[PDB]
A paper describes a structure:
Poliovirus (PV) belongs to the Enterovirus genus of the Picornaviridae family. The PV genome, approximately 7.5 kb in length, is a single-stranded, positive-sense RNA enclosed within a capsid protein shell. The P1 is further cleaved by a viral protease to produce the capsid subunit proteins VP0, VP1, and VP3. In this study, we investigate the production, antigenicity, thermostability, immunogenicity, and structures of VLPs derived from PV serotype 2 (PV2) wildtype strain and thermally stabilized mutant (wtVLP and sVLP, respectively).
The structural comparison showed that the wtVLP is highly similar to the PV1 135S-like particles, and the sVLP structure aligns well with the native PV2 model. These data indicate that the PV2 sVLP adopts a native conformation similar to that of the corresponding mature virion, whereas the PV2 wtVLP is in a non-native expanded state. However, the wtVLP appears to be in an expanded state compared to the sVLP, as evidenced by the radius of the wtVLP being 170 Å and that of the sVLP being 163 Å. Structural comparison revealed that the two-fold axis channel, formed by VP2 and VP3, is markedly opened in the wtVLP, whereas it is closed in the sVLP. Noteworthy, a lipid “pocket factor” modeled as sphingosine was observed within the VP1 “pocket” of the sVLP, while the “pocket” in the wtVLP was empty. In comparison to the PV2 wtVLP, the sVLP contains five amino acid alterations, including VP1 T41I, VP1 F134L, VP1 Y159F, VP3 L85F, and VP3 Q178L. According to our structural analysis, VP1 F134L and Y159F are situated in the VP1 pocket, VP3 Q178L is located at the protomer interface and in proximity to the quasi-three-fold, L85F is present on the VP3 β-sheet, and VP1 T41I, which remains unresolved, is at the pentamer interface within the capsid. In the sVLP, the Q178L mutation transforms the residue from a hydrophilic to a hydrophobic amino acid, thereby enhancing the hydrophobic interaction between protomers. In addition, the residues F134L and Y159F enlarge the “pocket” to accommodate a lipidic pocket factor, which is known to stabilize the particle. While VP4 and the N-terminal (residues 1–68) of VP1 are unresolved in both VLPs, the sVLP, unlike the wtVLP, has ordered structures in the C-terminal of VP1, residues 213–231 in the VP1 GH loop, residues 134–149 and 160–173 in the VP2 EF loop, and the VP3 GH loop. Interestingly, the doorloop 232–236 in our PV2 sVLP was found to be in the “down” conformation whereas it adopts the “up” conformation in the PV2 native virion model.
Numbering used by the authors:
A (entry chain C): 61 to 235
B (entry chain B), D (entry chain B), E (entry chain B): 13 to 45, 52 to 271
C (entry chain A): 69 to 301
F (entry chain A): 69 to 151
G (entry chain C): 180 to 235
H (entry chain A): 152 to 201
Write the structure that this text describes.
């Protein structure tokens, strides 16, 4: 699915409940490959230091008859990355009730040991992890699609700021 | 449309059925008429093991604050402090589509005592009367444990007896909610602290019981079998702990 | 007689000190033994004077002035004289591209601060404010960047004592922008650090043994005290 | 005569030497210019392992909040919350009679970095740089670890170098106390939170170090050998914890 | 529920998603800081060719005011007057039932420049860069036109590159709408006049581009194939035309 | 912590960037292989840093400062020095 | 620096009567010395130290 | 072009022993750097008598 449209979608099915994570990534917008190519990541790549909270939104692109419940959790830095819903539910989390709202937004609090975080891969300024799990399952009736895709979006909050302008790492020139 | 924000946790739903506050009172701290207050550090939602609803399901039961014994700071404070007090916020989620059938009854029972499986009176052990996060199940009939050599010493709840020798129909006397798959896929309950003492031990005494019963059979379209996940998410409220001492390690097995 | 005007933190620290020397060469690219450009990681621990002065306190805040004293010389005397040399010093903050070739894209200085120097001119001087991510610069860190956790593989989670989180303050890339002279030329740029508006916290005892590495490790020379009689004046 | 009452703990002594507040500031909560506050539940005295003072003793060192990693609620909150902040109250007890001789120097060092035992720079592992409640010991000379196959990766403190290449005589620059067996058998220190950040991780960074050095040799009457217990009791102050997440389990061995 | 009434045309819908005004500004006539104003005669909705949405669809693109070149009085005024200015009201309709799946992203791009299919830079001809009412299609990969004798001289948009070498995910920077089949079957956009000049030629310069991308795959129940009509209805606003001259007849083929 | 002083348009764009290099030669006119003078069309698209920065927006207005950094060298070392 | 121009004098410590200890008491006892500056102390003419060295 | 360094050594300060030893780091010793061809370097010092 790399370098096509399919990389912008996360798949969901109507299988029985399982603690295996649906989605996982690290809060490294300027270093994580999945976030470094977003507008937030591209802007951060021009700066060395950054601070502020973020909004992560998820949109459900299934059918109307489809309903379910999902969990989106943020594990703060300094802890083993969540491997199951049981560890995920120990920290900040939000419940996406597919059937009442087609979109769900989660705000990542500024839990940090430093005033500003670095835009490079370093354990000094770990931003934690973000994981997505099932709550019960995706439920669909007869004559309904059983494979449904969700779309993820990332945006900066009102307190976001950057400093120490620098050259990006996604630019090259011959000679 | 409901949003439950507590501590560092938030639950958003669009298929709720408002909510009922047990006895009309929200949890409150002890009035005047050294304490430990974890505050938001403990007052947050924790998700218990998701159960499966089938056609043959007879019901499930959990004990509080027993179900939270392993939920991070709340359980740590319960095992570190001799006495404690806290209310509960219970959220039951049961997703279903327009082609599904059935209904769940959620009952908050104070002093939910269950009948044992042995001839000896009240002979259930602590380790079997405190299942923990996994709760337990209801049976369709009473089975007598005749294993004299190695008695099971477990409870023997009966669905139509509510597990306490009382007709299930009267179970609605307790604070309750009804999750009807055709109107709402989730329900919420607010349970204030209930006891004869202002504070009481968090390991010797259980304050509440949550009973989920299949008020109507589960069905889906014309299929011969269907399964519905049921999730139970619980959050302590107005946590108060007292009598700091060495960690308590209850026996298992 | 007290005054205490030269004993202030500003007076004590407001003095230029050489921290590094960057060496570059102007020669034909085909000679792999020559370095057309150089990259130096910014740090004050390469020297001992300013390092010793700074380690007197655990925490500090200050603005900085950088001075670049440039000198150059020939490797031969049988090739007449060369033309005036022009030097480029580019700042590379964390995450910015590292130059790989003497004339690659990284020298475009699209957003990287750069200073151009002409040989013979007064030494280039620049000023930088406090750029610490934390609220104050830390000269010591009693901790690790990564904490190994139970169940992790023995090849992961390892980090050096103290590591470097607040110390990632970028690097400097020095090159010659003029055409490659037929005769090899060797140039050296001395970087002088001058702090201003210095505030300090948590005083520490002076270093007693020679500095070995950026940390507090030592291997030898642990006998600084000389011999003197107990009752001898 | 001194009485230190904090949380649910109290220490009473009649052989104290008043006290010194490091940098003249008591611990305080972060000002404005969801948090978790255990309050008295964590702000109490915990007793660390008692050490033995002999004629050959070279000194002892402990790290904070490392030494409190296993002390009940404080350690639980440190391992449950990503970031934290707290001051310390340190009490050193060294009982002696009128026939004893010697003196101890207690030093509170911010950012107490110790030299390693290996040729590689800063090559000590986390598991050896964080001894825990047992702290460590000082050596009389520098020993180089030549075990290339299996390096020890431990610290190599030197008593007269203070473990950081600085003459022990200058160690009095730090907030310090002197326990002289002929005037006082105990001492107390108040250490406010010190760091470049308002809050910082409680597992990656150590805020303080407590160094006990034998400023004078230990002797008793005309006996050929004598031992003096030294007890170190520490209490956190103004506990604040942030970033609730899954429990952190640092690697051992 | 939305009603768009303009000129002599009216569009009524009950499955809308409100609307977004590009850059927060509605179309307005040029302020002071002989013109021709067709007014309602031109400011009305015109329906462009309906396209088919399939599982293999990669996307569609239209150019404005290019798409209105043949729409009656608006196109007549554009071909009769040298310079012109007008905003746009775009309405995208995508009907679906409760059993359908998928989502469309509608993007209004100023200066929507598309990459060519030939090695020569910007070698696309006018006749292929101005499709008209039929717009064009997006490709799943870049194909290089090697027909040196008779180059196609057409655009080669790539869906994941947005046709301009930019990741499709960033395309949301432009004013955009999302038509999700489970919440709304239509969307509306208001695009004010955008250019570096107050007025500009209506034949040499294109002001806006409308891009419809399949943000989610199209599916229906358990069928192996399904098709959804997509309709694009556009209305000019605040029409202004200047420089009356002989009719302009652009070359074709 | 916000400030947003270095994230402004001025701060983002107010940075010097190399856009072109013009090469000239000082030699005898009779050598047709040497270029005594050069002509360069003004444009920012010869580079990638400033081009990428500018293409972040469709329209822009600004004043410009041009800086000319001149360097020179010899093609031989057996002819002493030049003026 | 070491120069007779600015001699600061000498400091000496002597016994007055003796150190007296009873039976079953240590007969060898150590004393510790400390030095500090007064409120009128001041310095000037900042210069490099003589207890610092660097290779190359 | 030649560049000259003139370093002040007050009483008790290290005396350089080699042309490129540590004493030339000028950590706290005042120093003046001169480029050949520039106007002669000039400095001012106040009364420094004990
Ligand atoms: C060509 C332009 C050059 C621009 C140079 C900018 C470099 C900025 C470096 C900032 C260094 C801050 C001062 C150092 C602080 C302390 O020493 C460290 N925290 C401890 O090592
Ligand atoms: C590179 C920096 C050079 C700095 C030079 C500072 C030198 C200061 C010397 C002070 C000399 C004071 C003037 C001399 C006084 C009288 O002549 C003597 N007391 C009598 O010989």
């Amino acid at each position: 699915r790399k370098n096509t449209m399919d990389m912008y979608r996360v798949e969901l099915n109507d299988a029985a409940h399982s603690d295996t994570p649906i989605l996982c990534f690290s809060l490294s917008p300027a270093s994580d490959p999945r976030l470094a190519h977003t507008m937030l990541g591209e802007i951060l790549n021009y700066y060395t230091h950054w601070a502020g909270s973020l909004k992560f939104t998820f949109l459900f692109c299934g059918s109307m008859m489809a309903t379910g419940k999902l969990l989106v959790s943020y594990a703060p830095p300094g802890a083993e990355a969540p491997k199951s819903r049981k560890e995920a539910m120990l920290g900040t989390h939000v419940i996406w009730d597919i059937g009442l709202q087609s979109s769900c937004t989660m705000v990542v609090p500024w839990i940090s040991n430093t005033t500003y975080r670095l835009t490079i891969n370093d354990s000094f300024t770990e931003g934690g992890y973000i994981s997505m799990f099932y709550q019960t399952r995706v439920v669909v009736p007869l004559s309904t699609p059983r494979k449904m895709d969700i779309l993820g979006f990332v945006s900066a909050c009102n307190d976001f700021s950057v400093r120490l302008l620098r050259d990006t790492t996604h630019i090259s020139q011959e000679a | 449309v409901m949003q439950l924000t507590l501590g560092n946790s938030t639950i958003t739903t669009q298929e709720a059925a408002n909510s009922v506050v047990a006895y009309g009172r929200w949890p409150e701290y002890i009035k005047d008429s050294q304490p430990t207050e974890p505050d938001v550090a403990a007052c947050r939602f924790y998700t218990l093991d998701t159960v499966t609803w089938r056609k043959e399901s007879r019901g499930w039961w959990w004990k509080l604050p027993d179900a939270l014994k392993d939920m991070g700071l709340f359980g740590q404070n319960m095992f570190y402090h001799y006495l404690g007090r806290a209310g509960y916020t219970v959220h039951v989620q049961c997703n279903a589509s327009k082609f599904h059938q059935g209904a769940l009854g959620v009952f908050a029972v104070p002093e939910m005592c269950l009948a044992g499986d042995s001839t000896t009176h009240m002979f259930t052990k602590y380790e079997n009367a405190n299942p923990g996060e996994k709760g337990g199940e209801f049976k369709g009939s009473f089975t007598l444990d005749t294993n004299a050599t190695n008695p099971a010493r477990n409870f023997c709840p009966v669905d139509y007896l509510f597990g306490s020798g009382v007709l299930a129909g009267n179970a609605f006397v307790y604070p309750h909610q009804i999750i009807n798959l055709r109107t709402n896929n989730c329900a919420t309950l607010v349970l204030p602290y209930v006891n004869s003492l202002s504070i009481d031990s968090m390991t010797k005494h259980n304050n509440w019981g949550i009973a989920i019963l299949p008020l109507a059979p589960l069905d889906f379209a014309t299929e011969s079998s269907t399964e519905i996940p049921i999730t139970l998410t619980i959050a302590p409220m107005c946590c108060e702990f007292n009598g700091l001492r060495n960690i308590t390690v209850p026996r298992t097995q | 007689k007290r005054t205490r005007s030269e004993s202030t933190v500003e007076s004590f620290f407001a003095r230029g000190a050489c921290v590094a020397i960057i060496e570059v060469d102007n020669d034909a690219p085909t000679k792999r033994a020559s370095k057309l450009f150089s990259v130096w990681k910014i740090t004050y621990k390469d020297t001992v004077q300013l390092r010793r002065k700074l380690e007197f306190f655990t925490y500090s805040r200050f603005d900085m002035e950088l001075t670049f004293v440039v000198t150059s010389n020939y490797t031969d005397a049988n090739n007449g004289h060369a033309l005036n040399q022009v030097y480029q010093i580019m700042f590379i903050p964390p995450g910015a591209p590292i130059p790989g070739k003497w004339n690659d894209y990284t020298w475009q200085t699209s957003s990287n601060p750069s200073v151009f120097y002409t040989y013979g001119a007064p030494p280039a001087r620049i000023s930088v404010p406090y750029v610490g991510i934390a609220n104050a610069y830390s000269h010591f860190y009693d901790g690790f960047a990564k904490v190994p956790l139970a169940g992790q593989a023995s090849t992961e989670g390892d980090s050096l004592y103290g590591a470097a989180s607040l110390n990632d303050f970028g690097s400097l890339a020095v090159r010659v922008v003029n055409d490659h002279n037929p005769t090899k030329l060797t140039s050296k740029i001395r970087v002088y650090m001058k702090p201003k508006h210095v505030r300090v916290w948590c005083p520490r005892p002076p270093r007693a043994v020679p500095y070995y590495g950026p940390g507090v490790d030592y291997k030898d020379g642990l006998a600084p005290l000389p011999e003197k009689g107990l009752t001898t004046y």
